[PDB]
Amino acid sequence: SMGESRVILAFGDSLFAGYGLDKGESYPAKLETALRSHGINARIINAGVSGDTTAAGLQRIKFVLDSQPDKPELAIVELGGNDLLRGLSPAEARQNLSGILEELQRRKIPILLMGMRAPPNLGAKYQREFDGIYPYLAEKYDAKLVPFFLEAVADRPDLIQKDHVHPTARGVEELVSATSNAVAKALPAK
């Protein structure tokens, strides 16, 4: 094919950075290769930063854009999962994401928003509020939306890395039942 590659900014968190994966296995790298099958030669800027919250993304969006030798022709924005992990306000996440999208819109950079979904641990009230920020933002900022970015792995635990293992409250009881003898034995008798 003719011509320089199309520049895409992948602006996100550990899901773009490729946490736990080897070189070339991250989503932006594999997406770049897959776009060849759509007739596209892309250079995807991997601006994923592990642990980035929406506020962290807002803090760096201008710097990331100003650092580019070639202006992005599309920005893919994938943030909010870390806000969920910290239990942070969904309203503040929406406000922070709004600031990111406003900067992209100012520069006339098209936006694709990757929708994030809350797990049931925080409760239905928080989950409904968090999930709704993405369709709201896509409408407000004329962005295309992938409603549920992680949908394709949602029912596939075999496709999810084993790393953090946080017991549930019932899981904690299981650990206590298995380890209390050892604790009692390690404590000097009174």
* DSSP output for 123-160: -HHHHHHHHTHHHHHHHHTT-EEES-TTGGGTT-GGGS
- Cα–Cα distance for residue pair 60/11, rounded to 1 Å: 10
Q: Experimental technique used?
A: X-ray
Closest CA to 9 of 39, 46, 40, 53: 46
Say whether 1 sits in a helix, a strand or coil.
Answer: coil
The C-alpha atoms of residue 87 and residue 19 are separated, in whole angstroms, by 21
- 116 close to 53: Cβ distance less than 8 angstroms: no
- Type of residue at 92: E
Q: How many Cβ atoms are within 10 Å of 132's Cβ, its own excluded?
A: 12
Q: Determine the Cα–Cα distance for residues 7 and 179; give it in Å rounded to an integer.
A: 54
**Resolution in A for the shown PDB structure?**
1.2
Residue 21: how many CA atoms within 13 Å on its side-chain side? Answer: 18
Find the angle CA(109)-CA(113)-CA(119) to the nearest 5 degrees.
160
- Buried b / exposed e across 92-124, counting CB within 10 Å, b at 16+? ebbebbbebbebbbeeebebbbbbbbbeeeeee
CA distances from 117 to 12, 113, 148 (A): 15, 13, 7
| Residues carrying an active site annotation | 14, 163, 166
Write the single-letter amino acid at 20. Answer: G
